[PDB]
Structure 1
Amino acid sequence: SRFKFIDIGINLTDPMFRGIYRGVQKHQDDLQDVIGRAVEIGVKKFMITGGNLQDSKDALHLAQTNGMFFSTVGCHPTRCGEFEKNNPDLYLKELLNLAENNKGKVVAIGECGLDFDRLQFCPKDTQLKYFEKQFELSEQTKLPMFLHCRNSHAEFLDIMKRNRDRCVGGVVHSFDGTKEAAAALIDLDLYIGFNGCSLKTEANLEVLKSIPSEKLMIETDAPWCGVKSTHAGSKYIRTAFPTKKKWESGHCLKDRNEPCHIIQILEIMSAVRDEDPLELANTLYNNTIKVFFPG
């Protein structure tokens, strides 16, 4: 109502929003209630993140259910082994066709990038090869990138510098790197995304203060990245939500982050930067429109 937000990365396809945890139905599907709470807090658009071919199809199909919903097409670093399970050239084409044939709903290439803290899911050589291959998607579709970078700044920056002309721009989401890393990404005319995972350490809060407002975007990565009392920014949260450990109607569930929690991320960022929250929220929204909704 007061604030307006675009969640640049919400996993609305995650089974937890249908009441399924570890393959077990624990409670009634409350996805519509989760969506409603976010709308009431000011979420105007939801970018449903795709993380592989099938999850990109699932994200688009859910996005087709609501005019506030949009999706991404790409392969997450942890899932890049899918390229070589079959034909990597065919897998790439299937992503391209899905993106190219659904302009309007599909607004970004991604999630893609590098995560050298999850090499148990996909080794470095495969991650490096298939992240760089997705620049074929960005160059052909003219869609901006939704990027992930964990424990991989040098390798990531090398790929981005060599391939920057093959994308129209993009955002490094869940940013958790140094001031120098942020500066190197800003020097490539990229944006920096902040969710709860961006705000866990004292150093994270200091790095945020070095980034201009017009270079930031906001997100939840729900159901992940919920802010805990052990995180450095938790003291700055101003809004709490009715929550239960065991599901009840009208309540969030403990440990399940939601899009409505994007207001907590805004409260932390505004407090850390000592910035008016409405001015910062409007700037974050406008940055997101400029990159992903330029129409």
Structure 2
Amino acid sequence: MFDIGVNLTSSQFAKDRDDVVACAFDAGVNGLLITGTNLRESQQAQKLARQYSSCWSTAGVHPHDSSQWQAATEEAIIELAAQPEVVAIGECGLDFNRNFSTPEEQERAFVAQLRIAADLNMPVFMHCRDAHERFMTLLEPWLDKLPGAVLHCFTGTREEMQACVAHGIYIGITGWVCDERRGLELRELLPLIPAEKLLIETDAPYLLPRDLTPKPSSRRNEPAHLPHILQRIAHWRGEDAAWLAATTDANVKTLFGIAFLE
């Protein structure tokens, strides 16, 4: 198995990062992709990915941080992207929340990063929150000249999922599926996701699985909880966990062009 969504740069891991990674590995997670959400965090992520075996990172600017996009940002992204730890441009995309960055600022930063990924022939690590129509409209002239893309932390409808996978987009499922109140629609479309488009993630330290037992007092999520998520997803899909683990691992290698041990 493989966690495509780990905010390992988070302050929540500052004291025990070596152990968090090692615990993830001891629990059978074969590799991590560390999220970059702005320029400095992307820089930290790449530094951390050097520190551990089977760790990679993304380089980019989250739509929340899109207001900081500048003329020098592109070159900085490319400088990072040139490094072998960096395997995707992102996290980038749209969130209909405009309080931290305007839709104008979001669209501009998003298109800019799609352009970089096309120039570098790299896949994109994407994010879409209540913005499917605008999102696909901007993606359209770029996605086909990209090696691939993932919609990480997918929270859309069944039709929206089907619209995305038609264009090759991988669907990233977190522990939110395990939320009884809030993850129902997600859980119900789950078996309809094509196996070869399915990717798995914790989004640690966030989205601690509600059906996880036992839970920490800190309520901090960690990649070591990935096997729980995979097992729940496999069950709801009516599949063997070992099989889906192999499938999703292949999806990661197909998408990011990386190699890691099974």
TM-score (norm 1): 0.83
RMSD in angstroms over aligned alpha carbons?
1.5
* 1:194 equivalenced with 2:173 (yes/no): yes
How do 1:157-172 residues align onto structure 2 when only pairs under 5 Å count?
A: 157-172=136-151
CA distance in 2, matches of 1:167, 1:6: 22
CA distance in 2, matches of 1:279, 1:54: 37
Task: Kindly indicate whether the alpha-carbon contact (under 8 Å) linking 2:118 and 2:142 is maintained by their aligned counterparts in 1.
Answer: no
**Distance change in 2, residues 1:185/1:134 (3 Å):** same
Is the partner of 1:43 in helix, strand or coil?
coil
CA distance in 2, matches of 1:30, 1:91: 31
Q: CA deviation at 1:287?
A: 0.8
CA distance in 2, matches of 1:82, 1:166: 27
Is the partner of 1:149 in helix, strand or coil?
strand
Unaligned runs of 5+ in 1: 19-28, 229-233, 246-253
1:184 corresponds to which of 163, 186, 194: 163
- Alignment-derived partner of residue 37 in structure 1: 23
- Alignment-derived partner of residue 257 in structure 2: 293
1:223 corresponds to which of 192, 200, 205: 205
Unaligned runs of 5+ in 2: none
Is the partner of 1:205 in helix, strand or coil?
helix
Q: Which AA in structure 1 matches 2:85?
A: K
CA distance in 1, matches of 2:253, 2:90: 17
Question: CA-to-partner distance for each residue in 1:163-193, whole Å, 9 max, x for gaps?
Answer: 2134211110111111111111111111101
Q: CA deviation at 1:139?
A: 0.9
- Alignment-derived partner of residue 250 in structure 1: none
- Alignment-derived partner of residue 261 in structure 1: 225
Task: Kindly indicate whether the alpha-carbon contact (under 8 Å) linking 2:49 and 2:85 is maintained by their aligned counterparts in 1.
Answer: yes
**Distance change in 2, residues 1:206/1:74 (3 Å):** same
CA distance in 1, matches of 2:138, 2:222: 32
- Alignment-derived partner of residue 11 in structure 2: 15
Q: Which AA in structure 2 matches 1:16?
A: Q
Q: CA deviation at 1:294?
A: 4.7
**Distance change in 2, residues 1:244/1:171 (3 Å):** closer
Range that drifts further, 144-153 or 60-69: 60-69
Is the partner of 2:33 in helix, strand or coil?
strand
Task: Kindly indicate whether the alpha-carbon contact (under 8 Å) linking 2:29 and 2:227 is maintained by their aligned counterparts in 1.
Answer: no
Task: Kindly indicate whether the alpha-carbon contact (under 8 Å) linking 2:36 and 2:57 is maintained by their aligned counterparts in 1.
Answer: yes
- Alignment-derived partner of residue 249 in structure 1: none
Q: CA deviation at 1:66?
A: 1.7
Q: Percent identity?
A: 36
Is the partner of 2:244 in helix, strand or coil?
helix
CA distance in 1, matches of 2:71, 2:38: 15
* 1:133 equivalenced with 2:112 (yes/no): yes
Q: CA deviation at 1:67?
A: 2.2
Aligned residues: 256
Task: Kindly indicate whether the alpha-carbon contact (under 8 Å) linking 2:61 and 2:91 is maintained by their aligned counterparts in 1.
Answer: yes
- The structure whose Rg is larger is 1
Q: Which AA in structure 1 matches 2:12?
A: M
Q: Which AA in structure 2 matches 1:52?
A: N
Q: CA deviation at 1:162?
A: 2.2
Q: Which AA in structure 1 matches 2:86?
A: V
Q: Which AA in structure 2 matches 1:223?
A: P
1:154 corresponds to which of 129, 133, 144: 133
**Distance change in 2, residues 1:59/1:281 (3 Å):** same
CA distance in 2, matches of 1:198, 1:109: 26
How do 1:47-58 residues align onto structure 2 when only pairs under 5 Å count?
A: 47-58=33-44
* 1:209 equivalenced with 2:173 (yes/no): no
Q: Which AA in structure 2 matches 1:12?
A: L
CA distance in 1, matches of 2:146, 2:257: 16
Task: Kindly indicate whether the alpha-carbon contact (under 8 Å) linking 1:8 and 1:219 is maintained by their aligned counterparts in 2.
Answer: yes
Q: Which AA in structure 2 matches 1:125?
A: E
